[PDB]
Structure formats: structure tokens, C-alpha cells
Coordinates of N, CA, C and O in Angstrom, one line a residue:
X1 N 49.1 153.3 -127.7 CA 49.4 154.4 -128.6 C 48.4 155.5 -128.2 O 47.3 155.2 -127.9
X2 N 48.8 156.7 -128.2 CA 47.8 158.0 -127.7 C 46.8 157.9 -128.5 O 46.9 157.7 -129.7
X3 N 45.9 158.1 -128.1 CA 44.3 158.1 -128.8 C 44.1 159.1 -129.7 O 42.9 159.4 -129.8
X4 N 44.9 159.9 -130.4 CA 44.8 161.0 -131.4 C 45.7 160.5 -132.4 O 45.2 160.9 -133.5
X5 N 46.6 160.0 -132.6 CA 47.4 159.8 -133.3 C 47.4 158.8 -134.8 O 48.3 158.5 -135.6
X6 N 45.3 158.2 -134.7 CA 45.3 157.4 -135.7 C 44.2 158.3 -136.2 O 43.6 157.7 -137.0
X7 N 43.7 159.4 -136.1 CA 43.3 160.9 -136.4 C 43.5 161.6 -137.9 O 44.7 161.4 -138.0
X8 N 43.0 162.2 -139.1 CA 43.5 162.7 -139.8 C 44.1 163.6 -139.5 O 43.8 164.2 -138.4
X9 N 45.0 164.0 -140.3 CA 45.5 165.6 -139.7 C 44.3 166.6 -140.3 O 43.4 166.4 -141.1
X10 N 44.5 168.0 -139.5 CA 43.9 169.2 -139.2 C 44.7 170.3 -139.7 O 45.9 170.3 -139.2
X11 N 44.4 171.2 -140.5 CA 45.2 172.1 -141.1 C 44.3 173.0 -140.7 O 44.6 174.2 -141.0
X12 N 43.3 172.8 -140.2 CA 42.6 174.7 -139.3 C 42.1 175.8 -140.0 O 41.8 175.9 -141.2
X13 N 42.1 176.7 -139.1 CA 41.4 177.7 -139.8 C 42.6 178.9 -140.5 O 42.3 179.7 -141.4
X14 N 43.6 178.6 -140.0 CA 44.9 179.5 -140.2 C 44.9 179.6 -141.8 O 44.4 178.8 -142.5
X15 N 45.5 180.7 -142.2 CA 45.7 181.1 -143.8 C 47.2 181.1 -143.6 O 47.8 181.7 -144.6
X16 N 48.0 180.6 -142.8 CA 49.5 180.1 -143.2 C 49.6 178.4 -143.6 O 49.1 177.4 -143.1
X17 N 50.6 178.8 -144.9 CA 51.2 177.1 -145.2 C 52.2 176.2 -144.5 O 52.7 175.2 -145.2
X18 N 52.4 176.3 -143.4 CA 53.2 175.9 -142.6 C 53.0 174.2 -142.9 O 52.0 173.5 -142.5
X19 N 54.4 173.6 -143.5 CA 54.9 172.0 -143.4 C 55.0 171.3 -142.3 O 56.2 171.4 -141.8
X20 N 54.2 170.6 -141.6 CA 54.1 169.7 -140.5 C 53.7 168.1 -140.8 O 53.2 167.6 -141.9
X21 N 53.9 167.5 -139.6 CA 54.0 165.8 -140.2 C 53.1 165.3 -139.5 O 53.2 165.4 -138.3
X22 N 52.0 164.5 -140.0 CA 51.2 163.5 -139.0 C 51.5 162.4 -139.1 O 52.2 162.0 -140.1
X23 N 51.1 161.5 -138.1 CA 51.2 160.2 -138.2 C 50.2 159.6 -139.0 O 49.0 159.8 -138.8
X24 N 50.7 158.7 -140.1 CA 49.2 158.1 -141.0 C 48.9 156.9 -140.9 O 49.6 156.0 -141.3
X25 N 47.5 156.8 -140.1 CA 47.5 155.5 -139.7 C 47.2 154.5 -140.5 O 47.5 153.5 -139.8
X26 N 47.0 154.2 -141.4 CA 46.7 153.0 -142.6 C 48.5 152.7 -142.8 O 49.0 151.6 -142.3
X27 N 49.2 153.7 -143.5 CA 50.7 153.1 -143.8 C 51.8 153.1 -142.8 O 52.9 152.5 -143.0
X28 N 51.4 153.9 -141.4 CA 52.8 153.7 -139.9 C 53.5 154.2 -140.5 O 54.6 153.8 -140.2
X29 N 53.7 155.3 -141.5 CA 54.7 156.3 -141.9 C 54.3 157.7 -141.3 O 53.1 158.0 -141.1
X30 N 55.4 158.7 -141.1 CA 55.3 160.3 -141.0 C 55.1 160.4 -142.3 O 55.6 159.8 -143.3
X31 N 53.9 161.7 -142.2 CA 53.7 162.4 -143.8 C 53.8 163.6 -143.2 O 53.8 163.9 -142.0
X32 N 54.0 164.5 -144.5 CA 53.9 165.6 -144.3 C 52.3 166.5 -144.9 O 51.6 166.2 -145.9
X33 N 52.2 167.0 -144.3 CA 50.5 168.1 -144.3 C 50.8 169.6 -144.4 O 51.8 170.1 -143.9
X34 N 50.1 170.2 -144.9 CA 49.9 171.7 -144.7 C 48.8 172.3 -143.6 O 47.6 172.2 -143.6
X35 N 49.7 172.7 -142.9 CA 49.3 173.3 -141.5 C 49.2 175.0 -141.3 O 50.2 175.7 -141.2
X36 N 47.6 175.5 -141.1 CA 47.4 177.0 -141.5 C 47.7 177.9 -140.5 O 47.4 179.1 -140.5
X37 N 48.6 177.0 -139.2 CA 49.0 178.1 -138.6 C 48.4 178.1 -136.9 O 49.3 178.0 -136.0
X38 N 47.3 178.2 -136.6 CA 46.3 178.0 -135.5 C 45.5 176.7 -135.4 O 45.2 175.9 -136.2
X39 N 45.2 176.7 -134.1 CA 44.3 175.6 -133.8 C 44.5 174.0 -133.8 O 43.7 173.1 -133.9
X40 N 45.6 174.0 -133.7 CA 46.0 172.4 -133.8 C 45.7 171.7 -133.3 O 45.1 172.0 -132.2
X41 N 45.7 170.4 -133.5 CA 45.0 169.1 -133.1 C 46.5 168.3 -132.6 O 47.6 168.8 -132.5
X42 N 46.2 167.1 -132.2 CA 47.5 166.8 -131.1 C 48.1 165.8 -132.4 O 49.3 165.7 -132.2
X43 N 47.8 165.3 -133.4 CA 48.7 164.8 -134.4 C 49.3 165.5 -136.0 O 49.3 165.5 -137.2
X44 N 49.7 166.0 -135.2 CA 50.6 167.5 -136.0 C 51.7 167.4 -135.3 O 51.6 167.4 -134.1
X45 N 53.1 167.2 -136.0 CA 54.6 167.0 -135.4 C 55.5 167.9 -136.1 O 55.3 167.9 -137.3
X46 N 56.5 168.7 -135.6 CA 57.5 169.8 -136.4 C 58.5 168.7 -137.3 O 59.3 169.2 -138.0
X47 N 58.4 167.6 -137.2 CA 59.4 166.5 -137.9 C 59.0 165.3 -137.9 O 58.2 164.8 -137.0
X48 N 59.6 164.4 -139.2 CA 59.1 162.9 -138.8 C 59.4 162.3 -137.9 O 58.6 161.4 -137.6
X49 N 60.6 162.5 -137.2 CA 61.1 161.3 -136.4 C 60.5 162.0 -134.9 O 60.8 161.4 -133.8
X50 N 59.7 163.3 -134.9 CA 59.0 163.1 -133.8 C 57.6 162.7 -133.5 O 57.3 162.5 -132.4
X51 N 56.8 162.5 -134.8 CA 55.8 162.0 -135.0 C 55.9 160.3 -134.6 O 55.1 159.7 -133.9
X52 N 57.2 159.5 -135.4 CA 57.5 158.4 -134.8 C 57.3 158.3 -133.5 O 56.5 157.6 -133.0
X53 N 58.2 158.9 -132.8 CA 58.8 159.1 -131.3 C 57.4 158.6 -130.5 O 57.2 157.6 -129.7
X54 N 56.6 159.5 -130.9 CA 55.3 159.7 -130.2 C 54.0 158.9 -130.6 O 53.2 158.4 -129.9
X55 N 54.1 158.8 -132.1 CA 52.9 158.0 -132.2 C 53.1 156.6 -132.9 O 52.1 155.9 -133.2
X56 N 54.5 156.4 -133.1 CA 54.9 155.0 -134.0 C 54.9 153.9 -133.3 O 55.7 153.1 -133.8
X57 N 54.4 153.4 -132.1 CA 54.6 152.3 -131.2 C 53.1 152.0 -131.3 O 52.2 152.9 -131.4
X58 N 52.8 150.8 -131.3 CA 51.8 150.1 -130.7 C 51.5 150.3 -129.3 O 50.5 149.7 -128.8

């Protein structure tokens, strides 16, 4: 599994609310986060089933 993806999400320094999804590692579900726009961290996904795609596998 990529070594960021068991990570909290990062919502940055940005002053936009932008809806993005991390992977959460305790439940193996997509959540959704509020994301401020800049500076992202690599477990931040535009949708759940891409956050699966990428970080839902062992």
C-alpha cells in the first residue's frame, strides 16, 4: 500500500472549502475532508472510488 495513504488528511494553508476524500486508515473506507485549496499531501482523492483505486489494497 503507498506509504501516505495511512496518513491523516491535510487541509493546508488554503482559505478554500474544497470536498476531497482520504483514505481512513482505522475504518478502509473513503471519507470526505475539507480541503483549503493548496499544498496537498498525497492522500487527498477528487472521489471515493479513487482513493480506493489507489489506496484500498493491502
Amino acid at each position: 500500500r503507498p506509504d501516505f495513504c495511512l496518513e491523516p488528511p491535510y487541509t493546508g494553508p488554503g482559505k478554500a472549502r474544497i470536498i476531497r476524500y482520504f483514505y481512513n486508515a482505522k475504518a478502509g473506507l473513503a471519507q470526505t475532508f475539507v480541503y483549503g485549496g493548496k499544498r496537498a499531501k498525497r492522500n487527498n482523492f477528487k472521489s471515493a472510488e479513487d482513493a480506493l483505486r489507489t489506496c484500498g489494497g493491502a
